[PDB]
Design a protein around this ligand. Structure first.
Ligand SMILES: CC(C)(COP(=O)(O)OP(=O)(O)OC[C@H]1O[C@@H](n2cnc3c(N)ncnc32)[C@H](O)[C@@H]1OP(=O)(O)O)[C@@H](O)C(=O)NCCC(=O)NCCSC(=O)c1ccccc1
Ligand SMILES: Nc1nc2c(c(=O)[nH]1)N[C@H]1C(S)=C(S)[C@@H](COP(=O)(O)O)O[C@H]1N2
Ligand SMILES: Nc1nc2c(c(=O)[nH]1)N[C@H]1C(S)=C(S)[C@@H](COP(=O)(O)O)O[C@H]1N2
Ligand code: SF4
Ligand code: SF4
Ligand code: SF4
Ligand code: SF4
Ligand code: SF4
Ligand code: SF4
Ligand code: SF4
Ligand SMILES: [Mg+2]
Ligand SMILES: [W+6]
Lengths: 653, 162, 170
């Protein structure tokens, strides 16, 4: 029998209203583990490149990680996968909370949606009971608001609900899916969900979930908890607060945001304010945050409590975590009070807290320059704050100028013209990046910006420190108990690495060292997004409780399959290449893999070419970014190599 | 005799529901072979929007519902109907096996070194403590006379013989 | 469909007068109103003025055994009593038990009477009872107050002892 996984999925046709439970192939588990990996397998051989994002044949997959529903601490992530309406590439999005584990308790590993529903509806799951309900009375309702009404309707107080806001219903290219204190935020997956007339997905589960090696599996679980205690008694020395400990960026706990407000760019990723964090500002923001934060809450089976309930006066309560705390504030040149109030509106609407702020600031720059006229913004209010609330409503409704801005900075500038493309200066593969315009070229981050399939920098980094220690004693101390490294050489790299001089960036670490680092950091994220493990306890923070050495044990004891360190490394490489192959088939080439032209002020073309060339070699790809026939056959992806040749993507010989 | 008190600091709870995970896991057969929050002897009443997080422990069995159910408003918070009842009651699913309906009851992890729910609550909202307490037939007679006065001696006599 | 009744308790409006204890004990005296005694009231007020705790607790379900562990809450800065929200007629405490016999007490909403008296006497309007229909069937094993009272004695003292005593009173 199957373990960790349930071995079953739901196939839903929203056009015919048909529902079907189908057993999964156990071979898929051995090759692609689960979550993102198996999502990639499904999308590959069911979604050909001729399928458009808002086409009925486009798929919307809700996947619970392999180890979700087990006692594994923090393992609770949902992986939503589809074809992005913004980037035209694959879009996988992660969501925390309690939804994924509930699905497992219901008896399912995934839910795959195809076609479209003519009427607004939501899916109701209660163990073996599955049905489609009408949701017309929920039209326009906010994401969180929607969940509460449903749980009253069905009389299921303990059901978990993933819903879309008005933004998703109106197919905003950066619309999200909201569930309590969790969000599948990026990729426009909310736009696809709305396009299919799917207002929400409600699931309740009370079945058992089994593991293969009970005693052994709980042993590793306790080993993690013990490490979390010890780790939280020994934060990383001389790092900032929101990087010393475990979990997601603890921005709800720490009031200090000097690193953020003085190193990140305000507005349309435009302005840098070196001396913003004054005493008056630090006190005003701490007061606002103490009054707004009700409680620090956690995800399922996790003690880190990264999120927080936010209560602004005269506004409904919503939940928040990580960097969305500042994006609306910094993009509007305002304060933390404004940011918390508009984030409430945006979370209910279901918008990406990264792109949305940059799109609105992008619009005001165009209005400032004169590329957009005041006639495009009728009835526009006077205040800077009021203008953001104004433009926010225009976007979610796709009203007038809001209809164009609802497509993202790339497509909006494309349609606007008149030099609007010049102000879309912060995109990679048509996707907005973090507002960061640093001075000196970073050889490690350059690679992560160019090749990251998520196209987000915060979701590929983690395991290697972002900066070197000034003193050698500090490095020797760090590498002392750095048991998470796959190889001793990662310790030796950090020892030699210095902030200034003959061993500083961009010329050090070397090109070969940078490639190895990027490959390790990326590998841990892909393992996380297949197992369902929150990165906060794994691939994100320094020296995590989960790593390349005990992960194989969790899989073996949990799922009952043969798994070791090397076999796991190869697995992660397998469906990370498959994801790559999916984007190749959709027209992605080396040309698309370049950072923004103004991302760094000091550029080194010859070093950057050597970096991307060497990294491709390590991955086993072409000098155009395409996985060769040799590496594909070696990975067990022969069917990919055949289709590449047949499609002319790869040449025979 | 010794009474054990489960100390629950609702202000410290974050709603991770880890307690439910480990409790049900241990009580699986064999132990840890599976888990299921519905089979947990501790259940967290959770509403983030109301700022309610209240760990509840499985208490006593009852074969009938109350004629009236209680529903509190305390310090601004509107709690659920029967929001604090530990009973395995026929009125809901709490503290009852999800497949058979049989009653569940916390036994403080009898036999084990420490309550697992307490052990996996790394934020320390839960603790169990002990203390000694001090342990006639005139009460019986008075009660019977009370029963005879309220229902009648003829009614009381016939009921006892059954 | 059946009807379930809910006792609505606004502890933020309570003043700790305990007028509810007076009337319930009064009405349930034999004969009615002949005397009163808060200790036999089926509504009992949790009251610590210094802690600002005012909580009306209605007598609930009978249980012949105590739990293996008692709970004790700290909620919103207030340290409530051990078992402070339990409605049970339990052998661990005197709440909801006759002070002289040990018999179980239970609120029947003044069954037979025009309206719940405690609610009638609570002029500040902290109490109220409302009704609603539900679809779930009543699987309660309905035992009479007479039957539950006798059984509690039989468990405490024995069937043979209780029987002989009954035949020595009638
Ligand atoms: C300190 C760094 C490492 C870089 O910041 P800085 O120190 O400012 O580095 P700069 O590049 O600005 O140059 C500084 C100055 O020194 C100069 N200079 C430089 N090198 C050299 C040299 N070798 N030799 C000599 N000089 C050198 C350089 O010319 C410049 O001087 P000028 O003014 O031009 O004259 C850090 O802040 C960082 O974030 N980096 C990681 C990458 C990253 O973005 N990761 C975060 C991802 S988001 C995230 O994780 C997250 C988001 C939300 C929520 C949660 C999480
Ligand atoms: N497996 C996995 N876990 C992850 C992440 C991820 O990308 N993959 N993102 C992390 C970051 S940076 C944040 S801010 C939170 C966001 O949680 P949410 O998606 O539930 O809102 O998830 C964290 N956990
Ligand atoms: N509406 C909304 N957008 C959001 C967030 C959020 O919490 N809410 N999280 C931000 C952060 S900090 C991260 S790391 C990503 C989460 O990535 P994902 O949800 O697409 O997997 O979304 C960003 N956009
Ligand atoms: S570390 Fe934070 S984001 Fe991750 S599971 Fe725990 S509470 Fe959730
Ligand atoms: S493990 Fe602790 S903090 Fe988490 S829900 Fe249980 S009692 Fe609350
Ligand atoms: S759950 Fe408790 S309070 Fe509610 S009807 Fe049952 S015994 Fe009475
Ligand atoms: S004390 Fe033991 S039996 Fe009771 S809820 Fe906790 S784990 Fe379960
Ligand atoms: S009469 Fe009302 S206010 Fe007074 S003690 Fe009773 S419930 Fe409280
Ligand atoms: S008073 Fe209630 S909670 Fe306390 S031991 Fe008795 S039945 Fe259990
Ligand atoms: S409703 Fe009637 S029987 Fe029940 S506690 Fe109030 S006065 Fe007493
Ligand atoms: Mg997310
Ligand atoms: W983040």
């Amino acid at each position: 029998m199957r373990y960790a996984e349930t071995g079953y999925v739901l196939e839903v046709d929203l056009t015919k209203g048909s529902i079907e439970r189908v057993a999964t192939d156990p071979r898929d588990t051995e090759l692609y583990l689960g979550g993102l990996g198996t999502n990639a397998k499904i999308l590959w051989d069911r979604v050909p490149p001729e399928v458009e994002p808002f086409s009925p044949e486009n798929l919307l997959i809700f996947a619970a990680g392999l180890l979700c529903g087990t006692p594994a601490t923090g393992c609770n992530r949902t992986i939503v996968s589809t074809v992005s309406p913004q980037t035209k590439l694959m879009a996988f999005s992660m969501m925390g909370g309690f939804w994924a584990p509930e699905l497992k308790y219901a008896g399912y590993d995934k839910i795959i949606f195809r076609g479209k529903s003519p009427e607004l509806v939501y899916l109701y799951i209660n163990n073996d009971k599955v049905e489609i309900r009408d949701a017309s009375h929920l039209k326009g309702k906010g994401a969180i608001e929607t969940a509460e009404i449903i749980k009253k309707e069905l009389n299921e107080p303990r059901a978990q609900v993933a819903a879309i806001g008005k933004a998703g219903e109106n197919r905003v290219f950066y619309a999200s899916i909201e569930q309590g204190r969790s969000s599948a935020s990026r990729g426009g997956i909310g736009a696809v969900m709305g396009d299919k007339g799917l207002k929400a997905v409600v699931v309740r589960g009370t079945k058992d979930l089994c593991v293969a090696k009970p005693e052994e599996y709980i042993g590793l679980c306790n080993e993690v908890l013990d490490y979390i205690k010890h780790r939280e008694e020994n934060p990383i020395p001389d790092v900032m607060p929101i990087l010393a400990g475990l979990g997601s960026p603890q921005e709800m706990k720490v009031h200090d945001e000097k690193w953020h407000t003085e190193n990140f760019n305000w507005g349309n990723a435009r302005t840098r304010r070196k001396d913003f964090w004054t005493d008056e500002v630090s006190h005003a923001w701490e007061k606002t945050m103490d009054k707004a934060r009700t409680r620090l809450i956690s995800c399922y089976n996790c003690p880190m409590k990264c999120g927080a309930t936010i209560s602004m006066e005269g506004l409904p309560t919503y939940m928040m975590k990580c960097f969305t705390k500042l994006t609306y504030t910094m993009a509007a040149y305002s304060d933390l009070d404004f940011g918390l109030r508009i984030a409430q509106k945006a979370t209910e609407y279901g918008l990406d807290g990264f792109s949305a702020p940059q799109v609105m600031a992008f619009a005001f720059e165009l209005l400032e320059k004169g590329i957009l006229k005041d006639s495009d913004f009728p009835g526009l209010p006077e205040g800077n704050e009021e203008r953001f609330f104004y433009l926010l409503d225009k976007i979610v409704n796709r009203d007038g100028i809001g209809d164009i801005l609802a497509n993202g900075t790339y497509w909006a500038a494309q349609e606007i013209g008149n030099g609007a493309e010049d102000y879309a200066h912060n995109n990679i593969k048509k996707h907005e990046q973090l507002p960061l315009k640093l001075s000196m070229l970073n050889p490690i981050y350059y690679l992560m910006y160019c090749t990251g399939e998520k196209i987000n920098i915060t979701q590929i980094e983690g395991q290697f420190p972002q900066a070197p220690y000034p003193k050698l004693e500090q490095r020797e101390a760090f590498v002392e108990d750095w048991i998470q490294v796959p190889d001793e050489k990662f310790k030796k790299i950090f020892l030699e690495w210095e902030p200034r001089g003959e061993k500083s960036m961009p010329n050090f670490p070397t090109v070969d060292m940078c490639c190895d680092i990027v490959d390790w950091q990326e590998m841990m994220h892909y393992i996380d997004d297949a197992l369902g493990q929150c990165a906060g306890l794994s691939s994100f923070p320094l020296k995590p409780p989960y790593h390349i050495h005990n992960y194989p044990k969790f899989i073996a004891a949990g799922a009952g399959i043969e798994m070791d360190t090397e076999k796991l490394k190869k697995a992660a490489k397998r469906y990370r290449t498959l994801v790559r192959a999916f984007n190749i088939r959709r027209g992605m080439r080396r040309v698309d893999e370049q950072p923004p032209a103004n991302h760094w002020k000091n550029r080194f073309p010859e070093l950057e070419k050597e970096l991307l060339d060497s990294y491709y070699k390590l991955k086993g790809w072409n000098d155009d970014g395409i996985p060769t026939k040799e590496t594909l056959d070696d990975l067990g992806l022969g069917y990919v190599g055949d289709e590449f040749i047949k499609r002319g993507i790869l040449s025979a010989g | 005799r010794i009474v054990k008190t489960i100390n629950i600091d609702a202000d410290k709870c974050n709603g991770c529901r880890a307690c439910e995970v480990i409790c049900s896991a241990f009580h699986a057969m064999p132990p840890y072979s599976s888990n299921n929050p519905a089979r947990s002897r501790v259940r967290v009443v959770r509403d983030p929007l109301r700022d309610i997080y209240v760990p509840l422990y499985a208490g006593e069995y009852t074969e009938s519902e109350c004629i009236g159910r209680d529903k509190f408003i305390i310090d601004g918070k509107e709690y659920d109907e029967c929001g604090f009842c530990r009973a395995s009651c026929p009125s809901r699913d709490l503290f009852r096996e999800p497949d058979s309906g049989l009653p569940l009851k916390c036994d403080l992890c009898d036999g084990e070194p420490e309550p697992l729910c307490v052990k996996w609550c790394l934020v320390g909202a839960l603790s169990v403590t002990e203390r000694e307490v001090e342990e006639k037939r005139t009460e019986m007679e008075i009660g019977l006379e009370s029963l005879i006065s309220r229902f009648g001696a003829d009614v009381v006599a016939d009921t006892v013989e059954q």
